[PDB]
Amino acid sequence: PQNTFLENIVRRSSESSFLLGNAQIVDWPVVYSNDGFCKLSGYHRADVMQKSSTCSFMYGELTDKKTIEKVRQTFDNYESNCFEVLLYKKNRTPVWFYMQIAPIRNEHEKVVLFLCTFKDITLFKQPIEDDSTKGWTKFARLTRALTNSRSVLQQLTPMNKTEVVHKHSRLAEVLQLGSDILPQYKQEAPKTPPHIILHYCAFKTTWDWVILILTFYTAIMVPYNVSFKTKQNNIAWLVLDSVVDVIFLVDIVLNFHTTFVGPGGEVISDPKLIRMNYLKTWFVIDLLSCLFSSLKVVRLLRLGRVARKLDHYLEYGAAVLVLLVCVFGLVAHWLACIWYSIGDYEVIDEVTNTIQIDSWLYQLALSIGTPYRYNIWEGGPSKDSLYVSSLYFTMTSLTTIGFGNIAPTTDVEKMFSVAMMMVGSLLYATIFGNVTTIFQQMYANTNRYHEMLNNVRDFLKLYQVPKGLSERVMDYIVSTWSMSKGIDTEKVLSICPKDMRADICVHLNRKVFNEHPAFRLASDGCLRALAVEFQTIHCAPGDLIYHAGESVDALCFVVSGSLEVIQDDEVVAILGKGDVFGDIFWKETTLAHACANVRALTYCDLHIIKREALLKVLDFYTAFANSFSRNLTLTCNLRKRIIFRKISDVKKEEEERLRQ
Amino acid sequence: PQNTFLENIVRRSSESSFLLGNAQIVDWPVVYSNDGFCKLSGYHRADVMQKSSTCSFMYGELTDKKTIEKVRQTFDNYESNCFEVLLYKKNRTPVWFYMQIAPIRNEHEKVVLFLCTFKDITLFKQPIEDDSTKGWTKFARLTRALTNSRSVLQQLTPMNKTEVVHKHSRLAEVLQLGSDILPQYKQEAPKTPPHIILHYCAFKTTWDWVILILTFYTAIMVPYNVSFKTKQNNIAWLVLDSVVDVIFLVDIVLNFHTTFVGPGGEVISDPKLIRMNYLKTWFVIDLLSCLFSSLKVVRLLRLGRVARKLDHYLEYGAAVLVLLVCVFGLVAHWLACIWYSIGDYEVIDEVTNTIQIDSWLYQLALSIGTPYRYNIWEGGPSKDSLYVSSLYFTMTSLTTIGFGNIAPTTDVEKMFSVAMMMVGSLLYATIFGNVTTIFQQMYANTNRYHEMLNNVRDFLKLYQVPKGLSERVMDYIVSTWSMSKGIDTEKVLSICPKDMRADICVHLNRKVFNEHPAFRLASDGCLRALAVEFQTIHCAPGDLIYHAGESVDALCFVVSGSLEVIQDDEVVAILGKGDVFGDIFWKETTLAHACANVRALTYCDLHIIKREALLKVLDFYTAFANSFSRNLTLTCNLRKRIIFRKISDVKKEEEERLRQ
Ligand SMILES: [K+]
Ligand SMILES: [K+]
Ligand SMILES: [K+]
């Protein structure tokens, strides 16, 4: 969601000198100056900014009087025109310019900035100058002033009386740029050229899933047709092949119109580069795959598409497991096809006209019930039994079960089963490794929690901490890991540098900013500083925040629960739900003694800000410091003692007073 | 690629007093003084340096006048000679020296330094001295002055009239050291003695690979010939054994000429140590291996070479997997040989003349179709079937499949298969462990990324951060891990102490040094300091760098993208591609309030330098501070406010002015 507006202007201007200036401000100050205007005028792009976009500060002695007023109305009412003005450069050189004013538009059709395109026509006109000594001085400067607009732009007729042709060319340039000078200043979305498909669109993902399904179907079906002959053709299996072939041809055609992700950058939408990118990467595999035994078996090259498209899924853990189960099934099927091919070859030695007792097909025929007949040779098991038997055998050898119904007993079968076992061992090992890694991924976090728990327990047991204090520590550990689930705030906030840290911290401390009268005249910067400086704590019933002699160095705001400030074993304050206690740091400059114990009745919630951070923030911002001083009344100041005398003391002392 | 020049000089001088001095500088200052010249003259090697290499500061009263001039021309035109001079030591002792000047040469044949070898001939001449009281004082000092040159060098004829012999010896010494005094001062490469082969050469790696292939071939072939008899000799299997044996003899001969890597140091090229290093390490295994059943079976000791040479490959993960697959195959082959040996022994009990029904050879003969005949005993399976069957069986027991075609049923076979299973369990477990470690190696990094992603997601969900801000955080996380791929700059730059940190940081910030006019009069040290002090940030569209009240404490250089400085909801500046904004830290000494909001239009790229580091660098370097102050013009100073009044305000106020 970029806002590429300067990029479009510099891509369309083709070495121009646009002078973008603000519109809603009086005098229309200049906002941006291209580094082509720094040469046409001699002003560096630090002295031209914040000046009028009329170029009023280059208007001089003999500047055309009417043009100044006319461009003034042109800026008054928002409209676009073109002018020929006679300005002065930084060297007081009378030089002509072509003004191509064109207002810009906002998102919801509002004028925001004024664009001013400039061109130099010094050699194209007659710049009458007073401080001259010879006629030639009136000509050489013409070659000096125009260098990139005469030898580059108009060099075909550099002859006199063609100045009217130059004026006509300027008029044609200004008239035929109605939409080229208004790229609609706006925060837009990425745009693609016509007839280009985004690689992450909703259609492309569905197309990729369909291609994956079809590739798996072809991988399943091609070896079956190659090995289990099945040369009989039907209606429900001869049109599907053609449909899949034309679908893959459509995919090849449509893959020329995809947005290839750049090496570390973003998407590229240039048809002039994607075409040979695809050509050099994967135009060989697809062509051969989508074109006799070789022609029907080459279709297995379609797995390259599956390999390419499965990159983001391969990152996860369970996706690799599903992929490996799928390839396990596919490898079992392929080995079943090869096993049946061997078994069919070996039966019935063709040199003689006998049947080999060794081959697993003969043993399977014996164990099934249907034997071979005739001596041409006909009989044996049906076509479903052969495939299910081959798959069963090659699945008993990949899972390392090996029952022994169907087993190698011929010279070829044994030396093929050796390769079967060699491959299956590695495949099965990879499956085991993936499963154990998947389990370790979660048991890592669980064991990370349990290790800390065990370390705390062993530390408490080793130093014989008395019961009643170890219980509190263990309860705190359990409760904090229950509430937070091991999610530390500091590690998460370390990431996301200080643009989102401030926003997150302002959101977290919303319960001390929105509902408290001190933080209502604070600018956003001060609120961000305070939010990033607070930090928060969680209390538990019976826990003391301040003792009877601790140094108060924090302002604490209670957002949930109830506190109890007790002094001399007497309750002197009860706090809760919007009460602030602590000390007046900003006008005492001395750490105090906490005069009373602040216990927690219920499960409390406090946002405490340290003394130093608060003092720094209040020192940096002045007006908010006064507002905070005036608008903060502490409900329990833990610096001054409350002077009182209990009733029981009076009642006791009265007895002795009467006695004496 | 060392520059060992002092080492060669001290190894060749044999306790001399060379006085290396620079040549291209006037007066030829002394550069280095050996700690043998600190005794011949009494000058410590801190007062003799930066003095003339002519020893002009030891030239005294009665020094030989002609020799001073002659050595002066000898230094004038670059040439080597020898002189006999009469200098004074630190104690003003008239002492004779032998000068052996010899210029040194650069890489491309240039004179750089002048070498001056010295010797003492005090006792070898007549040092007439004035402050003497008795004749014996003219003799004892002769023994005092010469101690390491008379009792060590010339002690065979310590008799008078032999001083001419000493002069002849000095002449022979100086004449026959033409190349020994010029070791060609140059940054050379490691040099090996003639007829010594570098262990990491391109020939040695090919030789090692060939030896590995031959060792695997021998390991495959020797047990087959020992067990599967095959005593018939052919032409294609009797010369190969001799060729391999002579190749291994050549390897044994050639292993005496290898550069053994020292214990923690570098290669050693001393033939006097490598020979007994190899002799003590591995001269016993090779000799016996390269020398009846014992003689043909001892050739399996060649696996020691494989074990030795496979040390760097064993570090990786996949190499161990390939090695374990190879040893799995080799162990299966060896167990096949042992299994066939047992099966061949057990058939046909030789005490009687019957055939044992139990032995697996008989069952295999029944299941194949070819039975035993005769009762000497002839028939059975062919020689290919026996080996393929043995390998199949011992592969069904190592992969834990166990079909059951071929299975132990005799007393010996069962108690051998027990050991088979015991070994195979451990081998198969090791293969599984290696596979799971290999997978964990990469899933560690992937899970490390996913754990942080999940923690961020759970933190956002737990604290109910509103939508529209959690989306930005998640997008930032995804985008930064996409661009950087988890490669943190700080951890990489922590390594490589501050010689390559400076160079790397200068290279990274090349887009603010080369194309910016402030950094053009800065020495390399200042550029290194600034580069190591910058740090860089990446922005995103809509992200704010400075708010309306933040403290500007950084100079920011934009190298890619576009920024937008807006004040009072009005665009006042547009930045991009070489624009610097911030504050003038070096002449204000006060943190300011950012007067405007700096938003990012497109994906920006900023190099920001903090206030304190910049101030330290500009304080340490003085002239560059002035150059930086003069040559830096901020395009948007975020300290001063721009005073303006919008057009809508004027238009609105005019209506009320007319109304009243
Ligand atoms: K099994
Ligand atoms: K069985
Ligand atoms: K079995």
PDB file of N, CA, C and O in Angstrom, chain B residues 11-40:
ATOM      1  N   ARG B  11      68.137 -16.538  11.034  1.00  0.00           N
ATOM      2  CA  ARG B  11      68.516 -17.926  10.804  1.00  0.00           C
ATOM      3  C   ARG B  11      69.788 -18.064   9.981  1.00  0.00           C
ATOM      4  O   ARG B  11      70.486 -19.075  10.114  1.00  0.00           O
ATOM      5  N   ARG B  12      70.103 -17.085   9.138  1.00  0.00           N
ATOM      6  CA  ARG B  12      71.315 -17.116   8.330  1.00  0.00           C
ATOM      7  C   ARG B  12      72.506 -16.431   8.981  1.00  0.00           C
ATOM      8  O   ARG B  12      73.642 -16.851   8.746  1.00  0.00           O
ATOM      9  N   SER B  13      72.279 -15.399   9.796  1.00  0.00           N
ATOM     10  CA  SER B  13      73.381 -14.611  10.336  1.00  0.00           C
ATOM     11  C   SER B  13      74.257 -15.436  11.270  1.00  0.00           C
ATOM     12  O   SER B  13      75.483 -15.270  11.286  1.00  0.00           O
ATOM     13  N   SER B  14      73.647 -16.327  12.055  1.00  0.00           N
ATOM     14  CA  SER B  14      74.359 -17.160  13.023  1.00  0.00           C
ATOM     15  C   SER B  14      75.104 -16.289  14.041  1.00  0.00           C
ATOM     16  O   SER B  14      76.335 -16.242  14.094  1.00  0.00           O
ATOM     17  N   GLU B  15      74.304 -15.584  14.844  1.00  0.00           N
ATOM     18  CA  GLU B  15      74.786 -14.696  15.903  1.00  0.00           C
ATOM     19  C   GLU B  15      75.638 -13.562  15.322  1.00  0.00           C
ATOM     20  O   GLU B  15      76.844 -13.453  15.555  1.00  0.00           O
ATOM     21  N   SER B  16      74.966 -12.722  14.540  1.00  0.00           N
ATOM     22  CA  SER B  16      75.546 -11.515  13.974  1.00  0.00           C
ATOM     23  C   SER B  16      74.813 -10.290  14.520  1.00  0.00           C
ATOM     24  O   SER B  16      73.974 -10.392  15.422  1.00  0.00           O
ATOM     25  N   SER B  17      75.134  -9.123  13.970  1.00  0.00           N
ATOM     26  CA  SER B  17      74.666  -7.839  14.487  1.00  0.00           C
ATOM     27  C   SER B  17      74.135  -6.959  13.361  1.00  0.00           C
ATOM     28  O   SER B  17      74.527  -5.800  13.209  1.00  0.00           O
ATOM     29  N   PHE B  18      73.237  -7.507  12.544  1.00  0.00           N
ATOM     30  CA  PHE B  18      72.705  -6.752  11.416  1.00  0.00           C
ATOM     31  C   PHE B  18      71.931  -5.528  11.897  1.00  0.00           C
ATOM     32  O   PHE B  18      71.322  -5.527  12.970  1.00  0.00           O
ATOM     33  N   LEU B  19      71.965  -4.475  11.083  1.00  0.00           N
ATOM     34  CA  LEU B  19      71.500  -3.137  11.443  1.00  0.00           C
ATOM     35  C   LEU B  19      70.630  -2.553  10.334  1.00  0.00           C
ATOM     36  O   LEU B  19      70.898  -1.469   9.812  1.00  0.00           O
ATOM     37  N   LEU B  20      69.609  -3.308   9.924  1.00  0.00           N
ATOM     38  CA  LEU B  20      68.683  -2.905   8.868  1.00  0.00           C
ATOM     39  C   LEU B  20      68.323  -1.427   8.953  1.00  0.00           C
ATOM     40  O   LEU B  20      67.903  -0.936  10.002  1.00  0.00           O
ATOM     41  N   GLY B  21      68.494  -0.725   7.842  1.00  0.00           N
ATOM     42  CA  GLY B  21      68.178   0.690   7.782  1.00  0.00           C
ATOM     43  C   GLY B  21      67.486   1.034   6.480  1.00  0.00           C
ATOM     44  O   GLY B  21      67.744   0.429   5.439  1.00  0.00           O
ATOM     45  N   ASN B  22      66.599   2.023   6.554  1.00  0.00           N
ATOM     46  CA  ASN B  22      65.824   2.428   5.390  1.00  0.00           C
ATOM     47  C   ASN B  22      66.716   3.088   4.345  1.00  0.00           C
ATOM     48  O   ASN B  22      67.743   3.692   4.663  1.00  0.00           O
ATOM     49  N   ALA B  23      66.312   2.969   3.082  1.00  0.00           N
ATOM     50  CA  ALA B  23      67.098   3.459   1.955  1.00  0.00           C
ATOM     51  C   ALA B  23      66.524   4.702   1.298  1.00  0.00           C
ATOM     52  O   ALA B  23      67.280   5.613   0.953  1.00  0.00           O
ATOM     53  N   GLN B  24      65.205   4.768   1.109  1.00  0.00           N
ATOM     54  CA  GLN B  24      64.604   5.879   0.381  1.00  0.00           C
ATOM     55  C   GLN B  24      64.613   7.186   1.161  1.00  0.00           C
ATOM     56  O   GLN B  24      64.366   8.239   0.566  1.00  0.00           O
ATOM     57  N   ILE B  25      64.882   7.151   2.453  1.00  0.00           N
ATOM     58  CA  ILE B  25      64.915   8.356   3.272  1.00  0.00           C
ATOM     59  C   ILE B  25      66.335   8.899   3.299  1.00  0.00           C
ATOM     60  O   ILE B  25      67.311   8.147   3.218  1.00  0.00           O
ATOM     61  N   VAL B  26      66.457  10.225   3.401  1.00  0.00           N
ATOM     62  CA  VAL B  26      67.771  10.847   3.487  1.00  0.00           C
ATOM     63  C   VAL B  26      68.450  10.416   4.781  1.00  0.00           C
ATOM     64  O   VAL B  26      67.795  10.145   5.798  1.00  0.00           O
ATOM     65  N   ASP B  27      69.778  10.315   4.734  1.00  0.00           N
ATOM     66  CA  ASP B  27      70.649   9.894   5.827  1.00  0.00           C
ATOM     67  C   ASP B  27      70.455   8.430   6.205  1.00  0.00           C
ATOM     68  O   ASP B  27      71.172   7.938   7.085  1.00  0.00           O
ATOM     69  N   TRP B  28      69.528   7.714   5.560  1.00  0.00           N
ATOM     70  CA  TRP B  28      69.294   6.290   5.768  1.00  0.00           C
ATOM     71  C   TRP B  28      69.098   5.956   7.243  1.00  0.00           C
ATOM     72  O   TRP B  28      69.992   5.375   7.871  1.00  0.00           O
ATOM     73  N   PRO B  29      67.956   6.314   7.832  1.00  0.00           N
ATOM     74  CA  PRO B  29      67.743   6.041   9.256  1.00  0.00           C
ATOM     75  C   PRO B  29      67.718   4.549   9.551  1.00  0.00           C
ATOM     76  O   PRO B  29      67.316   3.734   8.719  1.00  0.00           O
ATOM     77  N   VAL B  30      68.163   4.197  10.759  1.00  0.00           N
ATOM     78  CA  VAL B  30      68.122   2.809  11.202  1.00  0.00           C
ATOM     79  C   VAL B  30      66.694   2.434  11.567  1.00  0.00           C
ATOM     80  O   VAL B  30      65.991   3.183  12.258  1.00  0.00           O
ATOM     81  N   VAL B  31      66.255   1.272  11.097  1.00  0.00           N
ATOM     82  CA  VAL B  31      64.901   0.786  11.325  1.00  0.00           C
ATOM     83  C   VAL B  31      64.870  -0.296  12.400  1.00  0.00           C
ATOM     84  O   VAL B  31      64.072  -0.231  13.335  1.00  0.00           O
ATOM     85  N   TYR B  32      65.737  -1.298  12.284  1.00  0.00           N
ATOM     86  CA  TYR B  32      65.768  -2.411  13.221  1.00  0.00           C
ATOM     87  C   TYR B  32      67.206  -2.697  13.622  1.00  0.00           C
ATOM     88  O   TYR B  32      68.118  -2.608  12.797  1.00  0.00           O
ATOM     89  N   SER B  33      67.403  -3.040  14.892  1.00  0.00           N
ATOM     90  CA  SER B  33      68.722  -3.354  15.429  1.00  0.00           C
ATOM     91  C   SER B  33      68.651  -4.679  16.173  1.00  0.00           C
ATOM     92  O   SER B  33      67.908  -4.805  17.152  1.00  0.00           O
ATOM     93  N   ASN B  34      69.424  -5.658  15.711  1.00  0.00           N
ATOM     94  CA  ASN B  34      69.464  -6.957  16.363  1.00  0.00           C
ATOM     95  C   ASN B  34      70.052  -6.829  17.762  1.00  0.00           C
ATOM     96  O   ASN B  34      70.858  -5.938  18.040  1.00  0.00           O
ATOM     97  N   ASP B  35      69.640  -7.732  18.652  1.00  0.00           N
ATOM     98  CA  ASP B  35      70.195  -7.718  20.000  1.00  0.00           C
ATOM     99  C   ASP B  35      71.524  -8.464  20.037  1.00  0.00           C
ATOM    100  O   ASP B  35      71.753  -9.308  20.910  1.00  0.00           O
ATOM    101  N   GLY B  36      72.400  -8.148  19.089  1.00  0.00           N
ATOM    102  CA  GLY B  36      73.795  -8.528  19.141  1.00  0.00           C
ATOM    103  C   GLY B  36      74.626  -7.291  18.891  1.00  0.00           C
ATOM    104  O   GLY B  36      75.808  -7.226  19.242  1.00  0.00           O
ATOM    105  N   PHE B  37      73.991  -6.294  18.273  1.00  0.00           N
ATOM    106  CA  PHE B  37      74.583  -4.973  18.116  1.00  0.00           C
ATOM    107  C   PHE B  37      74.433  -4.127  19.369  1.00  0.00           C
ATOM    108  O   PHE B  37      75.196  -3.172  19.553  1.00  0.00           O
ATOM    109  N   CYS B  38      73.475  -4.457  20.236  1.00  0.00           N
ATOM    110  CA  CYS B  38      73.340  -3.767  21.511  1.00  0.00           C
ATOM    111  C   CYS B  38      74.492  -4.071  22.459  1.00  0.00           C
ATOM    112  O   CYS B  38      74.642  -3.373  23.466  1.00  0.00           O
ATOM    113  N   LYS B  39      75.296  -5.087  22.161  1.00  0.00           N
ATOM    114  CA  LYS B  39      76.464  -5.444  22.955  1.00  0.00           C
ATOM    115  C   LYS B  39      77.773  -5.013  22.317  1.00  0.00           C
ATOM    116  O   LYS B  39      78.696  -4.610  23.027  1.00  0.00           O
ATOM    117  N   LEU B  40      77.876  -5.089  20.988  1.00  0.00           N
ATOM    118  CA  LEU B  40      79.094  -4.669  20.306  1.00  0.00           C
ATOM    119  C   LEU B  40      79.316  -3.164  20.382  1.00  0.00           C
ATOM    120  O   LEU B  40      80.440  -2.707  20.155  1.00  0.00           O
TER     121      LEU B  40
END
